[PDB]
XYZ file of C-alpha atoms in Angstrom:
79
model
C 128.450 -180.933 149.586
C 126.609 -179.170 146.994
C 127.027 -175.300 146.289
C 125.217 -173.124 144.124
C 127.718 -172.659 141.624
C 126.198 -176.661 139.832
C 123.155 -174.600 138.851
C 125.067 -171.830 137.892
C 127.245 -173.979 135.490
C 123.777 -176.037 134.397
C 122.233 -173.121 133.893
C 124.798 -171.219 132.403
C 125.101 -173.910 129.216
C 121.463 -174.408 129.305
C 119.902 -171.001 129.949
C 115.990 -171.117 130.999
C 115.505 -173.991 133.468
C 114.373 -174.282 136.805
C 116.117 -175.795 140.022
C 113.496 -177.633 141.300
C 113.821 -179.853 138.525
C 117.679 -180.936 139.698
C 116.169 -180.756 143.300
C 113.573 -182.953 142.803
C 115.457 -185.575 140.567
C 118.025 -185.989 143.975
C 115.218 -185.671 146.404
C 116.933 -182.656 147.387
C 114.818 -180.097 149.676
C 112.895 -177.590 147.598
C 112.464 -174.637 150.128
C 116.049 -174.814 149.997
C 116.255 -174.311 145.897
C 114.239 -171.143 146.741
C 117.125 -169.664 148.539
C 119.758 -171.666 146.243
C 118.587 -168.736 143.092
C 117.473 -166.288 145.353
C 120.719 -166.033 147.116
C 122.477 -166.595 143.263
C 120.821 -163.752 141.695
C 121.006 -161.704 144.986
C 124.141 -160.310 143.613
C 122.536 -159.310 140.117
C 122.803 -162.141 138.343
C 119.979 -162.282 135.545
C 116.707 -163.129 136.152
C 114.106 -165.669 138.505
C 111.110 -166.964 138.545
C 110.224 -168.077 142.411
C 106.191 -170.175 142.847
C 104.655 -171.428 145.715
C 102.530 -174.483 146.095
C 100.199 -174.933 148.826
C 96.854 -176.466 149.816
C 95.580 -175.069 153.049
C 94.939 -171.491 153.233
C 92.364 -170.607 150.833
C 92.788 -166.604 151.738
C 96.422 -166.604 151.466
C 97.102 -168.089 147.911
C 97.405 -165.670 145.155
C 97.821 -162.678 146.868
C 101.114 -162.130 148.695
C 100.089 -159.357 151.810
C 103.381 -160.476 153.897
C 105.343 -162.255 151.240
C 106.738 -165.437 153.391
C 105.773 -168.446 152.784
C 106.397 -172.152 153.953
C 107.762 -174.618 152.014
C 108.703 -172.538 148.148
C 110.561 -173.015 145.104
C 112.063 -170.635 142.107
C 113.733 -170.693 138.681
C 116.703 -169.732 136.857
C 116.765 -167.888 133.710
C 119.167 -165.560 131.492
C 118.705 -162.855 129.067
């Protein structure tokens, strides 16, 4: 349906964006997007930013001790 390589193109013209942003204007799950750049720059692509948002846990905000977290979105950018 929809592979990475549409952000890769997008970003590739544009250069510092995020994915969410795409995401969000389709409705398109977010946690997902997370994965969508992770998994894109996993090979040694460039360079992202992944942020959390959450309202619940007041110890676990900030801080990452474990580093999972539910529900998480990053961003693309080059050099």
């Amino acid at each position: 349906m929809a592979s990475l390589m549409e952000v890769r193109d997008m970003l590739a013209l544009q250069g510092r964006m995020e994915a969410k942003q795409l995401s969000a204007r389709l409705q398109t799950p977010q946690p997902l997007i997370d994965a969508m750049l992770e998994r894109m720059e996993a090979m040694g692509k460039v360079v992202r930013i992944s942020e959390t948002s959450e309202g619940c846990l007041s110890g676990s905000c900030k801080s990452c001790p474990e580093g999972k977290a539910a529900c998480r979105q990053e961003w693309w950018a080059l050099r």
